[PDB]
């Protein structure tokens, strides 16, 4: 796709202003829950490596892992949604601006279309 | 049991693959560590890419 050279792009902006026109992901998003699960797994692995009681060694450390993962996941999801919205917008604008290359298909019915029949024997 | 399953079916798919990969690994990894040969090969590949891919 290579949207790097897209006109009117701020060189180092994580989230452009126009990205505020899209619905933010819900806080109960399944992907955000998955980031929280990844944070919890990182906490458990950290406890295991340090040779500490895996489930209940540091509650503050596990909470910090979960919170950091959720934070980064939320912002990453916002950026992903904005980029996909940009791709769809460019697609639709281009297909509107070039009607010659995307002609309307002459709609046909199965009654007047001959498909070869291959019997199974 | 013996001739087909234990001998030839083994020889065709798995054993031939194992032998070929072992031979290729021995061939590739056997470098004496001399940079003379390394840079001679570098010159050869530079010449080959210069005259072939253009």
């Amino acid at each position: 796709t290579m949207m790097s050279g897209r006109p009117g792009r701020v060189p180092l902006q994580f989230l452009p202003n126009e990205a505020r026109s899209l619905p933010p992901p819900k806080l109960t998003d399944p992907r955000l829950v998955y980031m929280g699960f990844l944070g919890y797994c990182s906490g458990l692995i950290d406890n295991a490596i340090r040779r500490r009681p895996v489930v209940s060694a540091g509650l503050h450390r596990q909470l910090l892992y979960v919170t950091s993962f959720v934070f980064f996941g939320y912002y990453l999801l916002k950026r992903q949604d904005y980029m996909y919205a940009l791709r769809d917008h460019d697609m639709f604008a281009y297909v509107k601006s070039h009607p010659e290359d995307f002609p309307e298909k002459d709609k046909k019915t199965y009654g007047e279309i001959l498909e070869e029949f291959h019997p199974v024997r | 049991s013996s001739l087909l399953d234990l001998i030839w079916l083994e020889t065709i798919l798995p054993k031939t693959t194992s032998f070929i990969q072992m031979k290729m690994s021995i061939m590739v990894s056997n470098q004496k560590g001399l940079i003379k040969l390394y840079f001679l090969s570098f010159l050869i590949t530079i010449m080959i890419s210069m005259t072939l891919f253009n």
Binding site: V55, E116, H118, V120 | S1, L4, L9, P14
Partner: protein
Amino acid sequence: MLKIIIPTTMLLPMTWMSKHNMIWINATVHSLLISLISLSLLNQLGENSLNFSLTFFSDSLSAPLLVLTTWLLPLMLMASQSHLSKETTTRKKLYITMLILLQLFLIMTFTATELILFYILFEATLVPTLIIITRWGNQTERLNAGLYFLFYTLAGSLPLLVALVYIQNTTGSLNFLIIHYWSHPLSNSWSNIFMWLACIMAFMVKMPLYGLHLWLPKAHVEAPIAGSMVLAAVLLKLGGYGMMRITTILNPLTNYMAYPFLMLSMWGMIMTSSICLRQTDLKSLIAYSSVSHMALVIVAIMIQTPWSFMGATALMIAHGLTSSMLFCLANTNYERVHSRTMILARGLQTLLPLMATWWLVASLTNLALPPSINLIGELFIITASFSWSNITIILMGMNMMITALYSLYMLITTQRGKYTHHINNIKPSFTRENALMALHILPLLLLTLNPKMILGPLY
């Protein structure tokens, strides 16, 4: 479907926070409870499917396999309860974790409305199996067996990924509903021939087809008991399920691309049935029997007629249950004998009568005795192949006779005759083994009353 997937996931925290002496009880109870929940899926309708959501759907082909998969896990736990007595708590919990992960991957695989998700889970089912085989295996050949099992599968299934992404690029969707509704004929071209081969070989290697079956005896012999049952019962059906799902886009090329595989299977059934006769090992004999039955299933699927599909599904379920039972019995014998050789222990019927009864019932079911679903699937495939060509009956009858011969040879060598004199550690059979055999066999004789539940969507 999430009412099934979520409890299977919750089985992991349940196991890991259990007491050191109560993991088996909790795992068995909740696995059985999960199986009851899975029973609801069996009530399929003559229309399309039970389209639960955009990601999971259930058919009358997926329902029997799903129920069998959910039912197998308690039996695997009861089988593994024996040889894990002297194992540390962490390693036992890891073993149960591997079994639960395998069940979860299989459950997510069998519905998998999209083909790429199906492939992802179909290859994900390979890691826990390899870990189980290579970690908790007795013999020193478990490493080579694991390597064979990994590479035979992966080499076949790697071109399948390329074929699938190509199909998505051209067709535009890999959802099975759209794939079925928008299917178009495949022209006779070299590119289409290689697409056919790529889409078929990945499932034919796992079934397995004759000539690519070298990994199966090794994987079945060197694996522990639970790995053996999960390989023989469910993991072999992945290839057939995938083939019956994916043959919807390969027409009409299959009409002439099935000849090499049909010939290979129809001759390899005879070859492996003959191999079973001259065998010095029990688990190897059962593995070769599984190869023969799966070759018959391959023939049925490649014929591509409604009776073929019905017989294929019935044979899938029946062979899964029968092979699991046979592996259970062989493991119970091996635990007392510690040798794993057919002629080393003889005349066990005089010492263990009820286990002799279980052996007889399992051999009769494997022998395809009416009106068991084994013979239902067998006979459906026989009639379909006879319609395909009148000469197949010769090969199928030869296979039937050899199957009876080696089944009764297995029964007679280990049960009849005079007991071996120098073995005096044949303790009376526990209640666990008898319960395991009963729970293996009773579902078969119960399903013979309602065959329509296992006859697939073309019923």
